[PDB]
Amino acid sequence: DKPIWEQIGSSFIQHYYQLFDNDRTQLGAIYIDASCLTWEGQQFQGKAAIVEKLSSLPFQKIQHSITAQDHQPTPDSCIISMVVGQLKADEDPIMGFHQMFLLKNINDAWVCTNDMFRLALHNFG
Amino acid sequence: DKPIWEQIGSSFIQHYYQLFDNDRTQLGAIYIDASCLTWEGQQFQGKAAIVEKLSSLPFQKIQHSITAQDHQPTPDSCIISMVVGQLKADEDPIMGFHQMFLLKNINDAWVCTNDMFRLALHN
């Protein structure tokens, strides 16, 4: 009785972070040539540029934890998902993050066409 | 200047928060009948339900400030806008929030088809 979009969105999220936290050089499998990534405000178009950027991050170990995830179907048969959570890389402070994914079913598989990620900064005084 | 999707997206965000902060019962103006909202994990389907929920919020006045806004175009001619910010309702403590919008041009006008909102935790 759980909607298809929640089932698919939840499984996609789990798989994405599993790949991210263990071997991000293998993340291309979930993107396509026409994909777009926005990381910390910077945009990257196309699978090649996206995998290059993600693989390039100066972290040795990364772990994501999901606080909440919401999924909805969109008018063009896609699935849109919003994730709020925390992340811990190396010995950097744990920080919150927000991420959005748009999934489309192509060739009988759900892949990501749009990925937007932003890490929270702490507001100092 | 800014890419077309950032121009449209940033203008939509301004319209949405201006309506929320100044006359939220008129928020229907930026939705369509089939829009969907998930608010603090609860889903409100259709413009009627969405506008009733937002109108019903237990505060008289609210002000939002956007601390970061990111926008992307999609292959199917839509725009995704991702926002982080702070808000203050009446005399309550300032609270952080995250919101995401999916926009589509329907009947020659950009409108929101999907909206997700979450208040910042802070355990």
Curated annotation (Swiss-Prot), chain B:
GO terms for molecular function: identical protein binding; nuclear import signal receptor activity; small GTPase binding; structural constituent of nuclear pore. Changing Y17A: Loss of interaction with GDP-bound RAN. Loss of GDP-bound RAN nuclear import. The modification N6-acetyllysine is found at K2. GO terms for cellular component: cytosol; nuclear inner membrane; nuclear membrane; nuclear outer membrane; nuclear pore central transport channel; nucleoplasm. PROSITE patterns: NTF2_DOMAIN. Changing H64A: Loss of interaction with GDP-bound RAN. No effect on interaction with nucleoporins. Decreased proteins nuclear import. Changing M82E: Decreased homodimerization. The keyword Nucleus applies. Changing M116E: Loss of homodimerization. Decreased interaction with GDP-bound RAN. Decreased interaction with nucleoporins. Decreased localization to the nuclear pore complex. Keywords: Acetylation, Cytoplasm, Membrane, mRNA transport, Nuclear pore complex, Nucleus, Protein transport, Translocation, Transport. Changing W5A: No effect on interaction with GDP-bound RAN. Decreased interaction with nucleoporins. Decreased localization to the nuclear pore complex. Decreased GDP-bound RAN and other proteins nuclear import. Changing M100E: Decreased homodimerization. The keyword Repressor does not apply. Changing I62A: No effect on homodimerization. Decreased interaction with GDP-bound RAN. Loss of interaction with nucleoporins and localization to the nuclear pore complex. InterPro entries: NTF2, NTF2-like_dom_sf, NTF2_dom, Nuclear_transport_factor_2_euk. GO terms for biological process: mRNA transport; negative regulation of vascular endothelial growth factor production; positive regulation of protein import into nucleus; protein export from nucleus; protein import into nucleus; protein localization to nuclear pore. It is found in: Cytoplasm, Cytosol; Nucleus outer membrane; Nucleus, Nuclear pore complex; Nucleus inner membrane. Residues 8-119 form the NTF2 domain. Homodimer. Interacts with RAN (GDP-bound form); the interaction is direct and regulates RAN nuclear import. Interacts with the nucleoporins NUP54, NUP58 and NUP62 (via FG repeats); recruits NUTF2 to the nuclear pore complex a step required for NUTF2-mediated GDP-bound RAN nuclear import. Interacts with CAPG; mediates its nuclear import. Mediates the import of GDP-bound RAN from the cytoplasm into the nucleus which is essential for the function of RAN in cargo receptor-mediated nucleocytoplasmic transport. Thereby, plays indirectly a more general role in cargo receptor-mediated nucleocytoplasmic transport. Interacts with GDP-bound RAN in the cytosol, recruits it to the nuclear pore complex via its interaction with nucleoporins and promotes its nuclear import. PANTHER family: NUCLEAR TRANSPORT FACTOR 2. This is Nuclear transport factor 2.
